[PDB]
Write a protein that binds this ligand. Structure first.
Ligand SMILES: [Mg+2]
Ligand SMILES: [Mg+2]
Ligand SMILES: [Mg+2]
Ligand SMILES: [Mg+2]
Ligand SMILES: [Mg+2]
Ligand SMILES: [Mg+2]
Ligand SMILES: [Mg+2]
Ligand SMILES: [Mg+2]
Ligand SMILES: [Mg+2]
Ligand SMILES: [Mg+2]
Ligand SMILES: [Mg+2]
Ligand SMILES: [Mg+2]
Ligand SMILES: [Mg+2]
Ligand SMILES: [Mg+2]
Ligand SMILES: [Mg+2]
Ligand SMILES: [Mg+2]
Ligand SMILES: [Mg+2]
Ligand SMILES: [Mg+2]
Ligand SMILES: [Mg+2]
Ligand SMILES: [Mg+2]
Ligand SMILES: [Mg+2]
Ligand SMILES: [Mg+2]
Ligand SMILES: [Mg+2]
Ligand SMILES: [Mg+2]
Ligand SMILES: [Mg+2]
Ligand SMILES: [Mg+2]
Ligand SMILES: [Mg+2]
Ligand SMILES: [Mg+2]
Ligand SMILES: [Mg+2]
Ligand SMILES: [Mg+2]
Ligand SMILES: [Mg+2]
Ligand SMILES: [Mg+2]
Ligand SMILES: [Mg+2]
Ligand SMILES: [Mg+2]
Ligand SMILES: [Mg+2]
Ligand SMILES: [Mg+2]
Ligand SMILES: [Mg+2]
Ligand SMILES: [Mg+2]
Ligand SMILES: [Mg+2]
Ligand SMILES: [Mg+2]
Ligand SMILES: [Mg+2]
Ligand SMILES: [Mg+2]
Ligand SMILES: [Mg+2]
Ligand SMILES: [Mg+2]
Ligand SMILES: [Mg+2]
Ligand SMILES: [Mg+2]
Ligand SMILES: [Mg+2]
Ligand SMILES: [Mg+2]
Ligand SMILES: [Mg+2]
Ligand SMILES: [Mg+2]
Ligand SMILES: [Mg+2]
Ligand SMILES: [Mg+2]
Ligand SMILES: [Mg+2]
Ligand SMILES: [Mg+2]
Ligand SMILES: [Mg+2]
Ligand SMILES: [Mg+2]
Ligand SMILES: [Mg+2]
Ligand SMILES: [Mg+2]
Ligand SMILES: [Mg+2]
Ligand SMILES: [Mg+2]
Ligand SMILES: [Mg+2]
Ligand SMILES: [Mg+2]
Ligand SMILES: [Mg+2]
Ligand SMILES: [Mg+2]
Ligand SMILES: [Mg+2]
Ligand SMILES: [Mg+2]
Ligand SMILES: [Mg+2]
Ligand SMILES: [Mg+2]
Ligand SMILES: [Mg+2]
Ligand SMILES: [Mg+2]
Ligand SMILES: [Mg+2]
Ligand SMILES: [Mg+2]
Ligand SMILES: [Mg+2]
Ligand SMILES: [Mg+2]
Ligand SMILES: [Mg+2]
Ligand SMILES: [Mg+2]
Ligand SMILES: [Mg+2]
Ligand SMILES: [Mg+2]
Ligand SMILES: [Mg+2]
Ligand SMILES: [Mg+2]
Ligand SMILES: [Mg+2]
Ligand SMILES: [Mg+2]
Ligand SMILES: [Mg+2]
Ligand SMILES: [Mg+2]
Ligand SMILES: [Mg+2]
Ligand SMILES: [Mg+2]
Ligand SMILES: [Mg+2]
Ligand SMILES: [Mg+2]
Ligand SMILES: [Mg+2]
Ligand SMILES: [Mg+2]
Ligand SMILES: [Mg+2]
Ligand SMILES: [Mg+2]
Ligand SMILES: [Mg+2]
Ligand SMILES: [Mg+2]
Ligand SMILES: [Mg+2]
Ligand SMILES: [Mg+2]
Ligand SMILES: [Mg+2]
Ligand SMILES: [Mg+2]
Ligand SMILES: [Mg+2]
Ligand SMILES: [Mg+2]
Ligand SMILES: [Mg+2]
Ligand SMILES: [Mg+2]
Ligand SMILES: [Mg+2]
Ligand SMILES: [Mg+2]
Ligand SMILES: [Mg+2]
Ligand SMILES: [Mg+2]
Ligand SMILES: [Mg+2]
Ligand SMILES: [Mg+2]
Ligand SMILES: [Mg+2]
Ligand SMILES: [Mg+2]
Ligand SMILES: [Mg+2]
Ligand SMILES: [Mg+2]
Ligand SMILES: [Mg+2]
Ligand SMILES: [Mg+2]
Ligand SMILES: [Mg+2]
Ligand SMILES: [Mg+2]
Ligand SMILES: [Mg+2]
Ligand SMILES: [Mg+2]
Ligand SMILES: [Mg+2]
Ligand SMILES: [Mg+2]
Ligand SMILES: [Mg+2]
Ligand SMILES: [Mg+2]
Ligand SMILES: [Mg+2]
Ligand SMILES: [Mg+2]
Ligand SMILES: [Mg+2]
Ligand SMILES: [Mg+2]
Ligand SMILES: [Mg+2]
Ligand SMILES: [Mg+2]
Ligand SMILES: [Mg+2]
Ligand SMILES: [Mg+2]
Ligand SMILES: [Mg+2]
Ligand SMILES: [Mg+2]
Ligand SMILES: [Mg+2]
Ligand SMILES: [Mg+2]
Ligand SMILES: [Mg+2]
Ligand SMILES: [Mg+2]
Ligand SMILES: [Mg+2]
Ligand SMILES: [Mg+2]
Ligand SMILES: [Mg+2]
Ligand SMILES: [Mg+2]
Ligand SMILES: [Mg+2]
Ligand SMILES: [Mg+2]
Ligand SMILES: [Mg+2]
Ligand SMILES: [Mg+2]
Ligand SMILES: [Mg+2]
Ligand SMILES: [Mg+2]
Ligand SMILES: [Mg+2]
Ligand SMILES: [Mg+2]
Ligand SMILES: [Mg+2]
Ligand SMILES: [Mg+2]
Ligand SMILES: [Mg+2]
Ligand SMILES: [Mg+2]
Ligand SMILES: [Mg+2]
Ligand SMILES: [Mg+2]
Ligand SMILES: [Mg+2]
Ligand SMILES: [Mg+2]
Ligand SMILES: [Mg+2]
Ligand SMILES: [Mg+2]
Ligand SMILES: [Mg+2]
Ligand SMILES: [Mg+2]
Ligand SMILES: [Mg+2]
Ligand SMILES: [Mg+2]
Ligand SMILES: [Mg+2]
Ligand SMILES: [Mg+2]
Ligand SMILES: [Mg+2]
Ligand SMILES: [Mg+2]
Ligand SMILES: [Mg+2]
Ligand SMILES: [Mg+2]
Ligand SMILES: [Mg+2]
Ligand SMILES: [Mg+2]
Ligand SMILES: [Mg+2]
Ligand SMILES: [Mg+2]
Ligand SMILES: [Mg+2]
Ligand SMILES: [Mg+2]
Ligand SMILES: [Mg+2]
Ligand SMILES: [Mg+2]
Ligand SMILES: [Mg+2]
Ligand SMILES: [Mg+2]
Ligand SMILES: [Mg+2]
Ligand SMILES: [Mg+2]
Ligand SMILES: [Mg+2]
Ligand SMILES: [Mg+2]
Ligand SMILES: [Mg+2]
Ligand SMILES: [Mg+2]
Ligand SMILES: [Mg+2]
Ligand SMILES: [Mg+2]
Ligand SMILES: [Mg+2]
Ligand SMILES: [Mg+2]
Ligand SMILES: [Mg+2]
Ligand SMILES: [Mg+2]
Ligand SMILES: [Mg+2]
Ligand SMILES: [Mg+2]
Ligand SMILES: [Mg+2]
Ligand SMILES: [Mg+2]
Ligand SMILES: [Mg+2]
Lengths: 48, 275
RNA sequence: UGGUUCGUGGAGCCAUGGGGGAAUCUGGGCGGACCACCGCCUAAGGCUAAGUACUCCGGGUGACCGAUAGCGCACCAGUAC
RNA sequence: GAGCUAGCCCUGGCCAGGGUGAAGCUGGGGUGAGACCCAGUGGAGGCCCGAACCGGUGGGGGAUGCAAACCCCUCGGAUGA
RNA sequence: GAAUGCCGGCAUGAGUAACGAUAAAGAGGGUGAGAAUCCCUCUCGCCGUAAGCCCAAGGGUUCCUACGCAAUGGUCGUCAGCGUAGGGUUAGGCGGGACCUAAGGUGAAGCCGAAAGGCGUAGCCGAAGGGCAGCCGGUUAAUAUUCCGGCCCUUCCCGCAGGUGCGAUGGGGGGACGCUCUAGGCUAGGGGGACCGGAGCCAUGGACGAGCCCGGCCAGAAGCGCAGGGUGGGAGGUAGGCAAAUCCGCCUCCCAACAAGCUCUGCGUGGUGGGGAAGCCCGGGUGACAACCCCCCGAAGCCAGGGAGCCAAGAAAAGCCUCUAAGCACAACCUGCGGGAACCCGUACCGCAAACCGACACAGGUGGGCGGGUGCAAGAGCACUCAGGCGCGCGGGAGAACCCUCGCCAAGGAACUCUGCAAGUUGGCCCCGUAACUUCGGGAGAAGGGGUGCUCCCUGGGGUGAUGAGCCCCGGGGAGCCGCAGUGAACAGGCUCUGGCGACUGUUUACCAAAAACACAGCUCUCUGCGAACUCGUAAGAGGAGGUAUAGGGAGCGACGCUUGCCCGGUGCCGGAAGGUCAAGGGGAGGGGUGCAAGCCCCGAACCGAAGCCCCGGUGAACGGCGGCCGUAACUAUAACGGUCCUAAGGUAGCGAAAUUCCUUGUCGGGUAAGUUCCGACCUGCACGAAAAGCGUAACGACCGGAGCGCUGUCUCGGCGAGGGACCCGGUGAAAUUGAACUGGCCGUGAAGAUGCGGCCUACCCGUGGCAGGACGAAAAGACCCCGUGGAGCUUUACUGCAGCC
RNA sequence: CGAUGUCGGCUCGUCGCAUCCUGGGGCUGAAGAAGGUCCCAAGGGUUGGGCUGUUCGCCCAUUAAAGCGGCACGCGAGCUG
RNA sequence: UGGGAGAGGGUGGUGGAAUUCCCGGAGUAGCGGUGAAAUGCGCAGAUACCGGGAGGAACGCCGAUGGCGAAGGCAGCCACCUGGUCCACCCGUGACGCUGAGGCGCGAAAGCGUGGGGAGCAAACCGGAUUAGAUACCCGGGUAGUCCACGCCCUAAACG
RNA sequence: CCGAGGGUAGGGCCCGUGACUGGGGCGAAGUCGUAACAAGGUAGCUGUACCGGAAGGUGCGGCUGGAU
RNA sequence: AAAAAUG
RNA sequence: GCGGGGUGGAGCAGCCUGGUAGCUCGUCGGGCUCAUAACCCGAAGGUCGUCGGUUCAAAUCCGGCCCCCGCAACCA
């Protein structure tokens, strides 16, 4: 049947994207948390 | 002159539709229409403020002139009468001798191809619009400005009308379609006569379909929901309300007066609505 | 109403949202309701180093661990997944 | 977090074939004029039968399954909410 | 040493289940250390509205080539979507961007909010919508509408010539639209052809034939022709389209009006350029100087912005056109010609799947287009089949039980069973014929019958054409032939009678309930006069609504028919300038602290003081409620009547052992050989009852009862047969569970149900296929039950608060 | 209670004797036939339907008889639900 | 042809009297009602009297033993549309007539459907009296209806 | 070919019958009331409508077959 | 301008 | 199992707070009538379900028994 994940490259980059992050004080903190942790990718990647 | 249908389908038994007799023109005037933004009962927040609305047929809003003191003393010929999906009343196209064209709500008995004009000296004749103070007492009138130069706010529904019961000072006394007696300022313009399509209330829908076509989604009773959703909800089997019948927010819905007490308009209301 | 040990207590003092609203030293605040006496201090403008706090960073030292312990990671780790 | 699900808004797309034959219209009859009747044309419908498509009624199988909801027979709606 | 402990490792089950569709395989010839699994050929089977082909999303080198097989592939492996290395994605015209806008988002102005931030006209972003100029053929191992070949086309710049008041983000026009049906004329595509082109073929009884088989096109500028779309022309006046305006709008006059013309498409033709088979020979070559024509069927597609009808009344902006303003008319625009310029990103491959979403090379899920031929009434249905693509990545044997799925059956035909669950019966089309009842449509395909194939003869009409032939499409009558059976295979309702419920099509518990629940039109109450009421939000702001009492919110009932009685004492709501009660506050009789005192400070009565509450009334389609005991009639029995206590008032109509009836299988009747269910009645209704509506109702229902016919493996009552498993051999090889084991029966005992203790009996050691009584067998720290001063959701006249309102 | 699946039916049985039949008897108010009551006896047998979820029971039609009970109200790692 | 009468019918418009309610003034111990009372109303200011307003219904005197129509039925006034009927003159057509099974239409009041309207009156209902009881006659309240529009029902002591 | 007739299916009319139920008819002498004939003690009747243990009461309109 | 049944 | 009740012939107050049983109908006697009912005037009748206890005294307060109503009987 239809599962949960139906990938969409536009939706992904607009929802979890970097520019989406910077627009909310929470999303800013999201980046700040990940940079301090040291993750290699602050945002899900997508090719566009 | 509502039409019926033979009952060839069980929903078509009772269905009735308007005769569309008075309608002369099948398509509106392109210059006077603009897109109607369908809200779906949802505000700017995105939350539903009015439940169970949306999904109706698409509509183009037709601009209406509710301020005929705009073009004083400039006559106009009734070009045509068209169907407006945005209100109960039919509307009439006006071809001003000025060349400008406008829609006004179509009063009953207005015949295509007749002069209409606005101004304190306009003849008392169906379709002409005057300030209230210059209109003979007792005449039928509609499209009443509630306050001066703010646009017609009263008696715009199909078949409605307002009567004049007397004057007092600058104000004149109207009998509104609700029966209320309201002092309205004399300088408030108003269009003489009664609103057309007075057979609107006898339209029997026929089936749930026409509730959706008009954009009215299904309305689900309270006692059918659950405690978390509504006061009447819950209860084993069917059950009465067991409490004063109350809205989904708790305020009682059986004869509870809600109008704000200290409202300044109270000074200008003579008699509460009838019946 | 808040702060102080002070939870309305005899409840001051400091601070203040509302109302009313002075004085320039013979002016004014405080010493726990309030009064008198006796004292202290001069509100409604501002700046001020040092003493104190922390450890991403560098070093030194351990009756600290020794690859299931010690940071999650001694190794290409916030990686694989 | 509304890329699953629920509701709405914007913009597009889809529904083989067949059956029934409302109103209206034209002709004729009818009457003082009408209502009305008859045949033709007409092609209405949350109409009918039935694929796609959308469903998931009954039964069986499957039960460490092909599958954390599937498969077979059967069955409902299918120009409309 | 234990914590259903944590990490890791290795066992047990077990060489057992399984190897992921039952569409299917065999042989031969290569290669290779090795082959059922790789490659080639012939034979066979499977899809063919796909299991074929092309796009879009998603995926990200999986495409091609070479060399490789440890691991990945449910076996094997030389093979591959795996490993290594090399190569591969070419655009002014396809798509997107340098154009436009919709939701929505963002947001100079402005508004709001303790901070963070929330709104918001314009503007801007935003596409699978609008706008926009390329078609055919070839070529690479792999790219192509991208390279190449031919024939076309757009924009930008400069130059020139011709024409004109040129000029815009400002005005106007246009762009510009729904649903159902639909004309005419084309095209795609399809069928036949004794006509044309063709390598061959003569089989096994016949056929040298008007034979067999193959093929008989594609694109194409100007011009031409057929078919359609669109648009009237001039003059005058003008106060409107937020300046101007010749434009647009409005008025008046004149000529024209199914036209014509002018303009735009579509198709046909068109210089020319390509393509072009079967077969045979080793992807290529011939076939070939290939031919390339006629008739018919014909679209949902094109002309298109066509036409008619209808109610629910059917996007915006730009490109394009016109109008004029500053400006400027040495210019600028338009047309034509010439030369010059034309950028970024995507192009591989998979793409109903082994490459996407499902942990897997997963029987599931995934939007758009093409989707051929014949026959069956038609069709995207069913069967077979072209092009094309596959036999689903373990096999080989055996022919037990048992399971799955499928086929058949004597006589009986629901005796099965909770129930005809299931499986039978019926089945498509034509024609005759068809009941109660009904809201006149219906019920109705009701029911119930008959026909159905092929051949010869005769004969009506339609389309094309021409009016005819040809081809095609509908029928009619007669005469006959074969079979058990003629929709000869596949797809394709069993029917009837009577109840309860709900009016109806519809909706839901994704993932055990599709219902009698929800919704629905329709009825009633009730709120709201506009900056509405209500809702969301602290607000600003929104929705309501660019709506205005024929409108909008809330509540209950739920088509329609006939109806909806009595009670306002209590609660709710509505009304009520009296009175009572009432906080802050005003007031300050009168007392207190202290100072020598002027004074300072505190307590503080009567009275004045809103809502609310008390109080007076109203109100049922507001919450709710609608009795007991006793006597009495010329047989008895029962009470039309009466007596009495009480209540605010005591249940009317209609219904009633019901979805409700305890006693209950109440009693009588029907149906049956027999009826705790079903139907009709009766009424002493434990405990129906009138908008949590009362009683009914034609039609509708995968709803739930009862009955009958038809037919059946449901059953008496089982039997045979087929295939996939189960079994055997080769390859690969899990699982939960598991204290350890050398694990028998009985009679007792034991924490009260023993392989383990006592006595007695029986019993050689170890397995394979089977059966499920035991190991209180596995699985889940019982979900019922209580326990915890454990938790959570919900209710109100429980307590105390807060929003909101007064 | 870190689980002992709970009615009934189907299938498959096995045991007990307080025997329903058949067999052997005593007594009888046993003439015969046919019964009544007790005694011995468990080898075999103990039907088919209607209604109800039923167990039980009633009813139809038969029968030599249409027995009562145990085995976790036998039996769900056998099924139905 | 020329004239007369009439509540004959249909539409529109219009006048005053009164009742009820609302507002204003003024006023105080009761009003209302019956055979007599009581329910009801009234100091929360009624009745009675004045002024103003809203709204519906019906048309006093004329008026009659009167008139009109086929019947049921029709009554303020103004206008418009229109039927029936009588007198006069003796002009015209020249038996063209009378009744009328079916058929069609009209048809008081009550009743019904959909909307409208709603002062007064008033079935059903509530209450007060009478009574053995009073589901009545009488008093206090009161909904359908009575009224307008359209569409049904078509009955009668529709009787002279 | 026609055809008595037999079989199946669906309809039409008539008669008999049925738990129960509806009123109706009569039946020397039951119960409860008194509506009508006198102005029947509320004039009577009537069409209709609502209600009531029952006759009947009331509402709208009509007749006199109503007395004074 | 009519209080009040029956045999 | 819990709750309420039993008193003239019928239906009910008195019971809560001990001392005195009352209301309507009915029954009887007598009036009006031709006669009945209606109506008027008088009158009669209850040892309080039963038994036991408390108390100076029990319809009355406390126990037991009988009967008549009424409510509950749930999770399985
Ligand atoms: Mg789907
Ligand atoms: Mg996942
Ligand atoms: Mg999706
Ligand atoms: Mg996308
Ligand atoms: Mg977002
Ligand atoms: Mg890095
Ligand atoms: Mg109209
Ligand atoms: Mg927004
Ligand atoms: Mg948002
Ligand atoms: Mg709407
Ligand atoms: Mg919620
Ligand atoms: Mg709640
Ligand atoms: Mg409730
Ligand atoms: Mg409920
Ligand atoms: Mg209930
Ligand atoms: Mg409120
Ligand atoms: Mg105002
Ligand atoms: Mg504090
Ligand atoms: Mg000092
Ligand atoms: Mg001082
Ligand atoms: Mg101090
Ligand atoms: Mg300072
Ligand atoms: Mg400092
Ligand atoms: Mg160490
Ligand atoms: Mg060391
Ligand atoms: Mg080590
Ligand atoms: Mg470590
Ligand atoms: Mg570190
Ligand atoms: Mg590193
Ligand atoms: Mg590091
Ligand atoms: Mg979504
Ligand atoms: Mg057809
Ligand atoms: Mg048909
Ligand atoms: Mg037509
Ligand atoms: Mg047709
Ligand atoms: Mg349909
Ligand atoms: Mg059909
Ligand atoms: Mg169907
Ligand atoms: Mg399709
Ligand atoms: Mg669903
Ligand atoms: Mg299923
Ligand atoms: Mg199943
Ligand atoms: Mg499952
Ligand atoms: Mg189907
Ligand atoms: Mg739709
Ligand atoms: Mg092993
Ligand atoms: Mg094993
Ligand atoms: Mg095995
Ligand atoms: Mg196996
Ligand atoms: Mg199969
Ligand atoms: Mg081989
Ligand atoms: Mg494929
Ligand atoms: Mg490959
Ligand atoms: Mg290779
Ligand atoms: Mg390998
Ligand atoms: Mg391998
Ligand atoms: Mg090019
Ligand atoms: Mg852009
Ligand atoms: Mg833009
Ligand atoms: Mg700003
Ligand atoms: Mg914003
Ligand atoms: Mg586009
Ligand atoms: Mg393009
Ligand atoms: Mg090509
Ligand atoms: Mg390729
Ligand atoms: Mg090229
Ligand atoms: Mg110009
Ligand atoms: Mg056509
Ligand atoms: Mg064809
Ligand atoms: Mg040749
Ligand atoms: Mg031969
Ligand atoms: Mg012109
Ligand atoms: Mg102008
Ligand atoms: Mg201008
Ligand atoms: Mg061509
Ligand atoms: Mg051409
Ligand atoms: Mg050659
Ligand atoms: Mg088109
Ligand atoms: Mg147009
Ligand atoms: Mg069109
Ligand atoms: Mg045209
Ligand atoms: Mg339509
Ligand atoms: Mg339109
Ligand atoms: Mg723009
Ligand atoms: Mg200038
Ligand atoms: Mg490509
Ligand atoms: Mg597809
Ligand atoms: Mg593939
Ligand atoms: Mg996959
Ligand atoms: Mg596979
Ligand atoms: Mg798959
Ligand atoms: Mg699909
Ligand atoms: Mg197709
Ligand atoms: Mg096709
Ligand atoms: Mg086909
Ligand atoms: Mg055939
Ligand atoms: Mg067919
Ligand atoms: Mg198929
Ligand atoms: Mg058989
Ligand atoms: Mg047979
Ligand atoms: Mg049979
Ligand atoms: Mg049967
Ligand atoms: Mg049985
Ligand atoms: Mg069942
Ligand atoms: Mg079945
Ligand atoms: Mg019948
Ligand atoms: Mg029919
Ligand atoms: Mg039927
Ligand atoms: Mg048939
Ligand atoms: Mg044949
Ligand atoms: Mg043709
Ligand atoms: Mg021909
Ligand atoms: Mg033969
Ligand atoms: Mg079939
Ligand atoms: Mg069928
Ligand atoms: Mg039948
Ligand atoms: Mg339903
Ligand atoms: Mg349905
Ligand atoms: Mg479910
Ligand atoms: Mg679930
Ligand atoms: Mg289901
Ligand atoms: Mg708020
Ligand atoms: Mg707003
Ligand atoms: Mg409303
Ligand atoms: Mg309901
Ligand atoms: Mg109902
Ligand atoms: Mg009621
Ligand atoms: Mg009340
Ligand atoms: Mg009250
Ligand atoms: Mg004070
Ligand atoms: Mg004070
Ligand atoms: Mg107060
Ligand atoms: Mg109550
Ligand atoms: Mg007796
Ligand atoms: Mg009633
Ligand atoms: Mg009653
Ligand atoms: Mg029964
Ligand atoms: Mg019987
Ligand atoms: Mg049953
Ligand atoms: Mg029954
Ligand atoms: Mg009984
Ligand atoms: Mg009920
Ligand atoms: Mg109710
Ligand atoms: Mg019913
Ligand atoms: Mg009916
Ligand atoms: Mg029914
Ligand atoms: Mg049934
Ligand atoms: Mg049944
Ligand atoms: Mg069988
Ligand atoms: Mg086999
Ligand atoms: Mg052993
Ligand atoms: Mg034992
Ligand atoms: Mg031992
Ligand atoms: Mg076992
Ligand atoms: Mg087994
Ligand atoms: Mg536990
Ligand atoms: Mg549970
Ligand atoms: Mg255990
Ligand atoms: Mg267990
Ligand atoms: Mg014995
Ligand atoms: Mg023995
Ligand atoms: Mg014996
Ligand atoms: Mg004897
Ligand atoms: Mg004998
Ligand atoms: Mg035996
Ligand atoms: Mg035995
Ligand atoms: Mg039976
Ligand atoms: Mg029983
Ligand atoms: Mg015997
Ligand atoms: Mg037991
Ligand atoms: Mg039992
Ligand atoms: Mg058992
Ligand atoms: Mg089980
Ligand atoms: Mg077991
Ligand atoms: Mg069950
Ligand atoms: Mg089941
Ligand atoms: Mg007369
Ligand atoms: Mg003559
Ligand atoms: Mg006549
Ligand atoms: Mg009437
Ligand atoms: Mg009416
Ligand atoms: Mg009255
Ligand atoms: Mg009438
Ligand atoms: Mg015959
Ligand atoms: Mg015959
Ligand atoms: Mg009488
Ligand atoms: Mg009455
Ligand atoms: Mg008597
Ligand atoms: Mg007594
Ligand atoms: Mg007492
Ligand atoms: Mg006494
Ligand atoms: Mg006496
Ligand atoms: Mg005593
Ligand atoms: Mg005493
Ligand atoms: Mg419970």
């Amino acid at each position: 049947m239809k599962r949960t994940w139906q990938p969409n490259r536009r939706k992904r980059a607009k929802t979890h994207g970097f520019r989406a992050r910077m627009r909310t004080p929470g999303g800013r903190k999201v980046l700040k948390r990940r940079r301090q942790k040291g993750r290699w990718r602050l945002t899900p990647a997508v090719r566009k | 002159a509502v039409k019926k249908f033979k009952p060839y389908t069980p929903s078509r038994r009772f269905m009735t539709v308007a005769d569309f007799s008075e309608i002369t023109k099948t398509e509106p005037e392109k210059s006077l229409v603009k897109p109607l933004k369908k809200t779906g009962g949802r505000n700017n927040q995105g939350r539903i403020t009015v439940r169970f609305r949306g999904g109706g047929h698409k509509r183009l809003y037709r601009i209406i002139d509710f301020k005929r003191w705009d073009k004083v003393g400039i006559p106009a010929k009734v070009a045509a009468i068209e169907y407006d999906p945005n209100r109960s009343a039919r509307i009439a196209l006006l071809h001003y001798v000025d060349g400008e064209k406008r829609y006004i709500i179509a009063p009953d008995g207005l015949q295509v191809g007749q002069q209409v004009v606005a101004g304190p000296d306009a003849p008392i004749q169906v379709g002409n619009a005057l300030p209230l103070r210059f209109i003979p007492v007792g005449t039928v009138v509609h499209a009443v400005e509630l306050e001066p130069k703010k646009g017609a706010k009263l008696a715009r529904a199909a078949g409605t009308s307002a009567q004049i019961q007397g004057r007092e000072g600058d104000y004149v006394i109207l009998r509104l379609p609700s029966g209320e007696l309201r002092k309205v300022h004399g300088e408030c313009y108003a269009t003489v006569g009664a609103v057309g399509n007075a057979d609107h209330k006898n339209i029997v829908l026929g089936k749930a379909g026409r509730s959706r076509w008009l954009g009215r989604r299904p309305h689900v009773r309270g006692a059918a929901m659950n405690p978390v959703d509504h006061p009447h909800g819950g209860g084993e089997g069917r059950a009465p309300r067991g409490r004063p019948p109350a809205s989904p927010w708790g305020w009682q819905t059986k004869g509870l007066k809600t109008r704000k007490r200290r409202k300044p308009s109270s000074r200008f209301i003579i008699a509460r609505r009838k019946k």
